[PDB]
Design an enzyme around this catalytic site. Structure first.
Site, PDB file in Angstrom:
ATOM      1  CG  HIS B  62      20.683  -1.353 -11.057  1.00 47.87           C
ATOM      2  ND1 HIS B  62      21.579  -1.048 -12.059  1.00 47.87           N
ATOM      3  CD2 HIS B  62      19.452  -1.120 -11.568  1.00 47.87           C
ATOM      4  CE1 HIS B  62      20.918  -0.640 -13.127  1.00 47.87           C
ATOM      5  NE2 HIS B  62      19.626  -0.679 -12.856  1.00 47.87           N
ATOM      6  CD  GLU B  65      25.080   0.887 -11.370  1.00 46.25           C
ATOM      7  OE1 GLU B  65      26.323   0.849 -11.296  1.00 46.25           O
ATOM      8  OE2 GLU B  65      24.415   0.143 -12.122  1.00 46.25           O
ATOM      9  CG  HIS B  66      19.511   4.165 -12.265  1.00 49.03           C
ATOM     10  ND1 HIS B  66      18.841   5.326 -12.579  1.00 49.03           N
ATOM     11  CD2 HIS B  66      19.363   3.344 -13.332  1.00 49.03           C
ATOM     12  CE1 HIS B  66      18.305   5.207 -13.783  1.00 49.03           C
ATOM     13  NE2 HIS B  66      18.609   4.016 -14.261  1.00 49.03           N
ATOM     14  CG  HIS B 289      42.060 -25.170 -27.295  1.00 47.42           C
ATOM     15  ND1 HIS B 289      42.539 -26.285 -27.948  1.00 47.42           N
ATOM     16  CD2 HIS B 289      42.289 -24.124 -28.123  1.00 47.42           C
ATOM     17  CE1 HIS B 289      43.034 -25.930 -29.119  1.00 47.42           C
ATOM     18  NE2 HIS B 289      42.895 -24.624 -29.250  1.00 47.42           N
ATOM     19  CD  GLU B 294      31.796 -25.012 -34.607  1.00 42.68           C
ATOM     20  OE1 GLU B 294      32.286 -24.353 -35.545  1.00 42.68           O
ATOM     21  OE2 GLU B 294      30.656 -24.815 -34.145  1.00 42.68           O
ATOM     22  CD  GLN B 316      37.538 -21.738 -16.495  1.00 44.32           C
ATOM     23  OE1 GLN B 316      37.133 -21.721 -15.335  1.00 44.32           O
ATOM     24  NE2 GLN B 316      38.806 -21.507 -16.813  1.00 44.32           N
ATOM     25  N   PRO B 850      41.265   7.660 -35.734  1.00 44.71           N
ATOM     26  CG  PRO B 850      40.957   6.376 -37.650  1.00 44.71           C
ATOM     27  CD  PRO B 850      41.121   7.793 -37.194  1.00 44.71           C
ATOM     28  CE  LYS B 851      42.049   7.133 -29.794  1.00 47.43           C
ATOM     29  NZ  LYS B 851      40.959   8.135 -29.948  1.00 47.43           N
TER      30      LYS B 851
END
Lengths: 8, 947, 940
Positions: B62, B65-66, B289, B294, B316, B850-851
């Site tokens: 980290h 990359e920083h 699933h 609910e 999971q 916008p896409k």
């Protein structure tokens, strides 16, 4: 999840 | 040039031609072409996580990359990557996982070479220095320092109580102590460790690349074969480990964790073997699933009916390459923490009731049909973020199914279902309880984060109460889904069609804005509503019953509409300041049924008393834990309260929850739904007669059940904004109770919304976008939270500064003023070509199509709720933006933003901590010791007239 | 000639004003008031000649004469010289005209008695009657008649005068229209001037003058001050015009009338003609019958009329007419069902009279009313200087010089034979009935001659008469029980260590706020209490405002039967509403205000609803709302201005539409919602203590919390509505078309600024320099109309300047001539000398500075400052001390910046009201959409 420059 | 693909699987809705290949050094390369793109991008993924740090120095990947973004040898300038990328409407970002590290950017129309070679030098040859290592660890310290109070402590406590000889029990961030203080305590160098880390791991075959190009699929393949060929294979095998970190000494155990914000949760952790090799049958998604579902007669709904559980997410959870978890994570009510053994008893009741019948063919067929239809109409993708995703899963799959990941399933084999279904046994359980009721009971504490917990290993009483005798409760399997779609016909474009949504109905009850979708041609259409009521925000009590009613409506309707949210019909119903809100989106076929049922469940609404008495407390503990939140977030909230006509604090609403009772709320809904007004847009694939039919059914159902009357046009009103004096320096401080950092937000208010004055503030906020980040964070190291841009509330626009830090806040406000002065000195010195470069960067950033369909529905609705109705403000505004001079921006600056300015409006919020290069002369501040009195003696701006 | 006759006059010892009565040898009654503590002196003259002595050919001559007597004396033949002399020295004159009186009165700044009396006495020596006075006052009379066209009082009065004997002078016309003044005389060639000099010479000079002078000099200065200027009056010995016979001489008895009104009202009018009992002031049987008939208590007449749902309210008693005859009237209101059962109502009235004929006269009632009027005579209040003299000169004709103060406040003897005689006069042979009702359409042909209302003779048939007389019995009607509301304690309380001259904040909580001031100057056995109950739910929606209205209305309708006996004892109250909250006032003797206020608070906390009462009040307010189409267009203009220049404003149209939604369960839900959570604010002023003031306020809020669980408000929701900001340049206007009145109002508003201490006196001084000359040139010279006004506007903490003019003009013509008057005043400033300036600024100074005359007056000024949250209790003295340090140059600078046509700050906006035959303002909401809002003035 250690992002650089944060967000927004 | 080793391997070339001929044609791979793509959804037939897309048009982007693809190509995959592999280079001489074993890099998996994917090519994306797009003739009609507007922001090209690329990404990379080195398959090295923070789980390959050396044991002495923690968090090298980290920090690497920083530290890598700053400085190479072929570009010795500190920011030439960031400066060139921000001169061309781009932005770069990166992060480290436990297994890999993503590097990705995006860039303007054709600037592929001048930014790809800058992203390439990243790995060809990097150069560091003393300066950067000296002022970068302070930002990594702020990184850890924002997460020492962040309850997302539970992660490291799951990492901790495992195998302490295992590489899973490692720390990812570094806190200036393991990074800086330990290695020079014992003389360990850092730069040599970084060059050894990089030259050992990163330069090898491991990384895969993808580039989203405009030109062709042959113009850029010879481009990327001559541009990443220097990084040389070091033949590094992928790190993995077949031994799962949970050894049997620390199984069958129940911890007790103390949080900072008042929450109540129950984590049930199971270990399972690796199922990433089985990405075709996917047994874990099947059991996800069937467990976490609910609806009628399922695991959640019974625990709802007994008042123990708010919600529960199953599924999971992935981990490292060798091992994998399985989680049923629950939240708890006030008396849910008394019956935890009975909760987990019901969980094994439902497990055994799903073990008595085992596999099901038709659930698999249903899920495979649903994933196939969800794959076939995949909406458009933003070119930044997408290439990072499809570079992030490129290591696992062959060239043909690079795209079809977790969408297509080939076989239903019940043998792996039985294997994963046998590993769920109460000899494999690890219960974890989070509760603020454990203040004085915890023995052990965390060193890294500082949390406290216990060891109550479960004696075999409750094991042989769990697996002894498990017939059933009243559970059942979920039934046939009826919200699955069957109509996929794109309605032909109407002979009369409009590029912008048109007012079609205008009555004293409602109005509409309608546009048939012309660009996207997907059989799905979103639709949203804004109901108004003058009684919704009158006083705290009436602003508080609204959230309780609305919430209990969503509670009592989740049981119905979870099958719609699972089939592809999503809704959202929340409150607003003015009235309530509704937004229903998804496939085009089953919108009426759903919206109708939402309306008739909204008006004809009864209250289950125990559900109200649960939700009242679940909101009372959601108001009062706002004090355990960021200092700078308190600052943004504080500014909104003092800058609006009326707003109520978080201390008022939790005071007026000592009055809400069942009969009071029960008489409130006929008061709220008695007189109201509807505003709505309908968008996507729908005809105009069906649009009028939709609003007809809506307002006729509210007429029929609520006896709704229209409002007078003189009580359709908005709120206004306080007008600061021509010369002003307002400030008032508050104290964050639980965070050790300070924070500040300072506000420069110019004026109302004009068409000639938004480009002044937007261009001045684009001219300081890169320098503000470099001076405040990269250089002066004032913290990790640096943001400066236009703020627009109630129309009135102002330029602000958000920054939170360890330093005392008036130091920050002085160094902001120093940045202003240095900024105008850099503005007056700049040449014409850089000024036209900034104007072109803003003319590309703002003139951008916008896409996704929701990305233009949120472009239309976000201005229709502001009552300006200016749809062509993306063209005419930027057509005015092209004719501006440097002198005009300097004029904007002098009388508005400068320190000597005549028209200068500035208000400041200081949020300070638990225990609290030439700045100019600053006028003595005026302290606000009372919010209401300050608002009274000040005028209010007029509202924006519509277009 | 100098003749004097007087002696000691009985004055209640509370009074210190020294008096002297005398009579001049030319037959002039003279009273002398000497109070060296009064700021403004005054004088009044009453002529006992009314419009009953008018010529039979020309109507309303004395009204036009009392208009014409203003302008022109031989010593001061200039036009406005009296009016300008009272504009310099703060004076204001006004006279009226009645059937038997014309009564001139005026006031003056401090001492200008010689001066104003020199401009007041020679009205009687030398009137001028020139071309322009004549030709201007005839339009002023015609506009006075024009505004009394739709005025129903005058209309029903004329219909009562004229439908009797058409020869009796009671049937003459009092005011006179333009036809009798200048249309019939000039076509018959009759000189008006010579008839005016005939009338003036024969009638005025003869006798029966009633000069009186409120002076502050001495018992002699004013004496030889008035005896000098009243010797030019010369006796003529005109006999006293009296009428020896009633107008109704059995030709018009036992008759009905059916009256068509403009406003949707319904009323019933019972009239009995009765002989003269003005000589019988010892017992005053007419007020004894008015006491026993018009009582509203347990078992009362109006109690049963309410219990039957026919009658809202009633009034009865003695109505004196000319010298000769008098009337005895009972005037009752009608509901919807009440109109159907008129004869039933009248039968119950007769039943009541018969109950009084059964138990006969009463003695203890006479002693009770004697003691109550004895107490009311003991403690009175110092009447304001102007109009006190007119009141004492009006009754000076009828009473000896010892009875001019003990006017009706003393009763010598008991006269049961008189009560039997007037009981013998109240019989159904004698009754005269008239009915007003809108439902009389197409049915009344016989039109009144002047105003134009329509009626019918329609004699009552005999079966209805005979059913009244012989069939007479008693039901649930019983005489009034002893009130037990009479005051018994009159002790004065001495001032304590808290010797403040201004109200101090003795209690502040988050629940209430209490201000207190013991009475230093007046020392009366009285107390005044004012209460505001602030709550958000009052003015949220037109529906909530209607519910609050109906709430207070039915609360009053509930409490009236209990309250009337205490109000007869001298403790009055009022419940009304605000746009912010509720308003409670309790004024009267300090002895029983705690018990009355206690039961009022306990009553409106725990409150119940009756069914048909709620229906009657509902229908009644729906009527009171849609009546507002029929009022005077200057009020329409002021209404639309108070709509546009506040923050939120609900129109009467919205209020009419929302009323239908209100029901009974919904109101019964609204009541505890309103009373649930609110704020209190109170002024306590009178002969009281600090501890008892705390105890009364405590008692009140404790009863509010005990009943409905009152909780305090949060200090961020006490919000007051703001005012829109006009743009720096631009004049706004829009129009509203009236339906009824053929008149065009106009109000020309100018926004200056918030009230700083400088801006108040800038605007007040410029307002006064344009006050009297606007009256001079517009109404007098230009003859625009009769209701012409100019001056300040005080609203929402924002100053303003206005010109309210209603006339029958094109409204833009009138706007244009207002701007012409502004140019006229702009040049009329710079040609002003120093003397006009200085006398004018001294006029402003003495106009503002004045001590109070009653605890209700000073209490009303302190409350009027506490409701505006300003609290500057001594702004008078500070603002006046600033006021004298001003120059003519400063006023010119103020006019140029904000009021000039070429002004860098002209914030102007008008409202045009048309008759039935810049930028526009289409939607008021859109107009308020893009205008900023002013701040609120900070407290002290």
């Amino acid at each position: 999840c250690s992002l650089y420059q944060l967000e927004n | 040039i080793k391997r070339i693909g001929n044609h791979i699987t793509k959804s037939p809705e897309d048009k982007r031609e693809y190509r995959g290949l592999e280079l001489a050094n074993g890099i998996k390369v994917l090519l994306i072409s797009d003739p009609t793109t507007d922001k090209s991008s690329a990404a990379l993924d080195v398959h090295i996580g923070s789980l390959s740090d050396p044991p002495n120095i923690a968090g090298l990947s980290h920090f690497l990359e920083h530290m890598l973004f700053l400085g190479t040898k072929k570009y010795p300038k500190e920011n030439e990557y960031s400066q060139f990328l921000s001169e061309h409407a781009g932005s770069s970002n990166a992060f480290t996982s436990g297994e890999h590290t993503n590097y990705y950017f995006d860039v303007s129309h054709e600037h592929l070479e001048g930014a790809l070679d800058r992203f390439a030098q990243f790995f060809l040859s990097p150069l560091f220095d003393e300066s950067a290592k000296d002022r970068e660890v302070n930002a990594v310290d702020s990184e850890h320092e924002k997460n020492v109070m962040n309850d997302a402590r539970l992660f490291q406590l799951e990492k901790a109580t495992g195998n302490p000889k295992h590489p899973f029990s490692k720390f990812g961030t570094g806190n200036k102590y393991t990074l800086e203080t330990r290695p020079n305590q014992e003389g360990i160098d850092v730069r040599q460790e970084l060059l050894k880390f990089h030259s050992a791991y990163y330069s090898s075959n491991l990384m895969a690349v993808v580039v989203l190009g405009r030109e062709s699929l042959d113009d850029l393949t010879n481009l990327v074969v001559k541009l990443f060929s220097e990084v040389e294979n070091k033949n590094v095998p992928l790190p993995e480990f077949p031994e799962h970190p949970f050894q049997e000494e620390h199984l069958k155990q129940l911890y007790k964790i103390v949080p900072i914000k008042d929450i109540r949760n129950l984590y049930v952790t199971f270990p399972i073997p690796d199922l990433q090799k089985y990405y075709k049958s996917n047994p874990g998604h099947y059991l996800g699933h069937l467990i976490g579902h609910e609806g009628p007669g399922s695991l959640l709904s019974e625990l709802k009916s007994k008042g123990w559980v708010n919600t529960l997410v199953g599924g999971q959870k992935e981990g490292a390459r060798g091992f994998m978890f399985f989680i049923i994570n629950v939240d708890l009510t006030e008396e849910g923490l008394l019956h935890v053994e009975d909760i987990i008893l019901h969980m094994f009741q439902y497990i055994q009731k799903l073990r008595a019948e085992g596999p099901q063919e038709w659930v698999f067929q249903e899920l495979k049909d649903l994933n196939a239809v969800a794959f076939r109409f995949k909406d458009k993708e933003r070119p930044r973020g997408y290439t990072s995703k499809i570079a992030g899963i490129l290591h696992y799959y062959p060239l043909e199914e690079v795209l079809t990941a977790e969408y297509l399933l080939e076989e239903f084999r019940p043998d792996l279902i039985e294997m994963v279904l046998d590993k769920l046994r109460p000899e494999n359980v690890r219960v974890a309880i989070v509760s603020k009721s454990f203040e004085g009971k915890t023995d052990r504490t965390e060193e890294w984060y500082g949390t406290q917990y216990k060891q109550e290993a479960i004696p075999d009483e409750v094991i042989k109460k769990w697996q002894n005798a498990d017939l059933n409760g009243k559970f059942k399997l979920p039934t046939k889904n009826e919200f699955i779609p069957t109509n996929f016909e794109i309605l032909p474009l109407e002979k009369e069609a409009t590029p912008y949504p048109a007012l079609i109905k205008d009555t004293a009850m409602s109005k509409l804005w309608f546009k048939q979708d012309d660009k996207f041609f997907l059989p799905k259409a979103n639709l949203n509503f804004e109901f108004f009521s003058p009684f919704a925000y009158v006083d705290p009590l009436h602003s508080n019953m609204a959230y309780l009613y609305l919430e209990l409506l969503k509670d009592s309707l989740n049981e119905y509409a979870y099958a719609a949210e699972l089939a592809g019909l999503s809704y959202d119903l929340q409150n607003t300041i003015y009235g309530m809100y509704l937004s229903v989106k998804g496939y085009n076929d089953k919108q009426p049924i759903l919206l109708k049922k939402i309306i008739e469940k909204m008006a004809t609404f009864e209250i289950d008393e125990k559900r109200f008495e649960i939700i009242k407390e679940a909101y009372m503990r959601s108001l009062n834990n706002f004090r355990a939140e960021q200092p700078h977030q308190h600052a943004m909230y504080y500014l909104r309260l003092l800058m609006t006509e009326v707003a109520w604090t978080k201390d008022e609403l939790k005071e007026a929850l000592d009055d809400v009772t069942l009969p009071r709320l029960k008489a409130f809904i006929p008061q709220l739904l008695s007189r109201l007004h509807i505003e709505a847009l309908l968008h996507g694939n729908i005809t105009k007669q069906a649009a009028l039919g939709i609003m007809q059914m809506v307002e006729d159902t509210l007429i029929e059940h609520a006896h709704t009357k229209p409002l007078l046009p003189s009580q359709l009103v908005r709120y206004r904004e306080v007008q600061l004096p021509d010369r002003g320096w307002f400030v008032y401080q508050q104290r964050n109770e639980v965070h050790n950092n300070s924070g500040i937000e300072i506000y420069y208010q110019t004026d109302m919304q004009s068409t000639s004055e938004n480009m002044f503030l937007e261009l001045f906020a684009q001219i300081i976008s890169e320098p503000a980040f470099n001076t405040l964070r990269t250089k002066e190291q004032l913290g990790y939270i640096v943001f400066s841009g236009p703020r627009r509330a109630n129309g009135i626009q102002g330029l602000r500064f958000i920054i939170q830090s360890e330093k005392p806040p008036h130091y920050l406000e002085s160094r902001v003023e120093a940045f202003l002065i240095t900024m105008e000195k850099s503005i007056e010195d700049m040449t014409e070509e850089a000024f036209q470069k900034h104007i072109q960067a803003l003319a590309i950033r703002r003139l951008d199509k916008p896409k996704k369909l929701s990305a233009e529905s949120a472009k239309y609705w976000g201005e229709i709720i502001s009552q300006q109705y200016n749809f062509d403000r993306d063209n005419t505004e930027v057509a005015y933006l092209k004719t501006l001079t440097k002198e005009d921006i300097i004029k904007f600056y002098k009388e508005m933003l400068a320190v000597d300015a005549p028209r200068r409006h500035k208000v400041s919020v200081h949020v300070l901590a638990r225990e609290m290069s030439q700045a100019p002369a600053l006028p003595q501040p005026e302290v606000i010791q009372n919010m209401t009195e300050f608002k009274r003696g000040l005028p209010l701006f007029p509202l924006v007239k519509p277009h």
